């Protein structure tokens, strides 16, 4: 009875504090910046072999190797330059929803509705790819996983929690609680110190890996958040949701900066990704095409329309010379 | 090109062949999704994710039981959905109707037919014969309902359980007829805890669905 009033007073204090810093907007300082113009991208390679909808994709650190996941129960490693296949990995469960590639190039991880994250060893003296360890402990389905090193991994699930794991022992070291809905997307900072999670409660939180405490909470969306991306400089968020709206958040101003939307878009957003320099913003939509956005002007610079179904994956190479897309039509495309 | 690139091409061709071979077996199994509330008797209709397999007339079926706003998106390629409702508990029929309305009008299942199972007919018949609880206590409109002249009751059934059963079936079906525009069909059935013919119904409904898809394919409808 008494704590609700205190919580409301604290929320009002935070709202008043945030409003005091809104002395300018991006739409006003960028009036002296020339537009990027029209950007044309064309298909350079087409990857065939998958027999089902593609759900997950991740680039390697060498800008040549690529991993994809589909509902056929197999994981394929691609050579982007020659289209030759390198490895094919059978899965113990066919309902896979995420995949990841180790920065050292030795391991790949995946998971899904079985509530287990599995790690595969890509370099063995036998020549076969074998399972190294299975991570159990979540109660809901697994939505995303990202590597920190060969021994630490961060996972997100639909039971409102996030966790930090020790691969050597398979024991959970820190649990992150505070969400009220299913957690969809993760994004790991370049400095491997903080990570960001979006959830179905239309809120996003910044977490401290070393301490396990939530630092900031952001609001503004009207529905579930499906994708979160990280600006290269470590001080900005990029989020997508099912209300056909994208938002830009800053970790120092603690408020929204710019909104990306258009009257002709009435479909959901499935993925968000950045270029190296941060000038271009890429997003996947349910209209069977992908849009190119200007992050500093909220304009539309281009569109990719080579798919025949929903776009589910989107990624950029570390050298910035290619973009890969995935759709439910069982095809992958490399754009340049 | 160098010899190692030719060997890599050969390995890629072998991998492509092995992927192509495996797809043949996958397409020969039909996939089903099972949804329902507690006390409905889901586990006995055919007796993270629970799975079961059965075969009728040289056709294999694979049924999935999860455990709904998010994971339902990955079941948009299934042949049919099985929905089970308890027909002998008047207090919770409105919840079942709301659940059926929420499943029928889902945007990701707009092309999937539904097989609807109304279970536990014996308990409903016993409750109607006992007369210790009346449907009008929860559904006012039942007092004005009359058995249709085209009814085909089973011989020996008292003409007081048929009225209730047809009332429940009408209350479920009227939702299905309000939307869909012919893209999908509902297949109501009456079942019980001891019936074994449930296997044939799924096979017949799936064959009908495939026939409808083929008829649509040849520009006949």
């Amino acid at each position, epitope marked *: 009875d008494q704590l609700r009033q205190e919580a409301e007073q604290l929320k009002n204090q935070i709202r008043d504090a945030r409003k005091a810093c809104a002395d300018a907007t991006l739409s006003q300082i960028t009036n002296n910046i020339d537009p990027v113009g029209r950007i044309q991208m064309r298909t350079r390679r087409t990857l065939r072999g998958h027999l089902a909808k593609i759900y997950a994709m991740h680039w390697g650190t060498d800008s040549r190797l690529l991993v994809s996941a589909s509902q056929d129960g197999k994981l394929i490693i691609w050579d982007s330059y020659t289209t030759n296949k*390198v490895h094919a990995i059978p899965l113990r469960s066919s309902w896979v929803m995420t995949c990841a590639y180790a920065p050292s190039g030795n391991y790949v991880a995946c998971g899904g509705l079985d509530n287990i994250c599995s790690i595969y060893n890509l370099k063995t003296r036998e*020549g076969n790819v074998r399972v190294s360890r299975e991570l159990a402990g979540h109660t809901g389905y697994l939505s995303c996983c990202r590597f920190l090193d060969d021994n630490q991994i961060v996972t997100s699930s639909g039971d409102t929690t996030c966790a930090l794991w020790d691969i050597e022992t398979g024991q959970q070291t820190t649990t992150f609680t505070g969400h009220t809905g299913d957690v969809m997307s993760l994004s790991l900072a370049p400095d491997t110190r903080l990570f960001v999670s979006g959830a179905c409660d239309a809120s996003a939180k910044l977490w401290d890996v070393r301490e396990g405490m939530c630092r900031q909470t952001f609001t503004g969306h009207e529905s579930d958040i499906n994708a979160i991306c990280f600006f290269p400089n470590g001080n900005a968020f990029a989020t997508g949701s099912d209300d056909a709206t994208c938002r830009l958040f800053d970790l120092r101003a603690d408020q929204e900066l710019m909104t990306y939307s258009h009257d002709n878009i009435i479909c959901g957003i499935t993925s968000v990704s950045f270029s190296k320099s941060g000038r271009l913003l890429l997003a996947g939509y349910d209209d069977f095409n992908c849009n190119v956005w200007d992050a500093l002007k909220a304009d539309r610079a281009g569109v990719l329309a080579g798919h025949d179904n929903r776009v589910s994956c989107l990624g950029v190479t570390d050298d910035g010379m290619a973009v890969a897309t995935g759709s439910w039509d069982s095809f992958l495309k490399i754009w340049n | 090109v*160098s010899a*190692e690139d*030719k060997a*890599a091409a*050969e*390995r890629s061709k072998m991998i492509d062949k092995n992927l192509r071979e495996d797809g043949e077996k996958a397409r020969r199994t039909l996939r089903l999704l099972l949804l329902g509330a507690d006390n409905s008797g889901k586990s006995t209709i055919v007796k993270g994710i629970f799975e079961t397999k059965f075969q009728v007339d040289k056709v294999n079926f694979h049924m999935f039981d999860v455990g709904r706003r998010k994971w339902i998106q990955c079941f948009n390629d299934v042949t049919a959905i099985i929905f089970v409702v308890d027909s002998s508990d008047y207090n919770r029929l409105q919840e079942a109707l709301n659940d059926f309305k929420s499943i029928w009008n889902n945007r990701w299942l707009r092309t999937i037919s539904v097989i609807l199972f109304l279970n536990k007919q014996d308990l409903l018949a016993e409750k109607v014969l006992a007369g210790k609880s009346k449907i009008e206590d929860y559904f006012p409109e039942f007092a004005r309902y009359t058995t249709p002249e085209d009814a085909t009751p089973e011989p020996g059934e008292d003409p007081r359980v048929t009225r209730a059963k047809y009332f429940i079936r009408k209350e479920f079906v009227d939702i299905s007829t309000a939307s869909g525009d012919g893209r999908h069909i509902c297949y109501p059935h009456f079942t019980c805890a001891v019936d074994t013919e449930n296997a044939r119904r799924i096979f017949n409904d799936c064959k009908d669905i495939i026939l409808q898809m083929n008829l649509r394919e040849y520009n006949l409808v």
Partner: single-chain antibody
Amino acid sequence: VQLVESGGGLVQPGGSRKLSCSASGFAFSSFGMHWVRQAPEKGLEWVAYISSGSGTIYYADTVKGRFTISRDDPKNTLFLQMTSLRSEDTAMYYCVRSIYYYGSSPFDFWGQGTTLTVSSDIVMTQATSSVPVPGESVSISCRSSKSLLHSNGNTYLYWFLQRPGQSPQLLIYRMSNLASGVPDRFSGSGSGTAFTLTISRLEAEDVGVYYCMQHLEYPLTFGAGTKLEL
């Protein structure tokens, strides 16, 4: 990872004999195999190659029409059929495992070998018979007749070390890549048709003969060999 060869013995000229090899401890069906022959006073010589899927088969220019190579995946065995043997065929035969994909090591493992007793090509040049020499630096060089740098950015030069009484062991593949299990004291560099091998600090285990090999076009060619005497 273990490779065992069988067969061998004494034969008369004009006769025939068949060789066999048993593989275990690895996925035999995913690997390609080579047979390499070494004579007492000639060095290493390439004989034949069979692909993992039995797709392509290559033979040396001195064995065509007389030698036949075959593969048996379900039994994890290799076979080499030899007919009309000559006096020049008396030598030791080795079995080598190879796998080809992006970033792989195609000459990582060598067998033990068996003994058989009877009664356009790119030239790889080495010229030193013995380098007398613990703790000192040693540099060994090789020279090729044609450039080994392909347009794709890769240079196909391989290095092997053969200790007394032991099979050759891979040290460097593609001129800059250190093989697994090798200490970091070995390094290599070069460009065009000139190549060098450098050892930072010698030990008692660094005594043997070093060989150079190219993998640009068939047939495969080996160098004369440089002996390091401590």
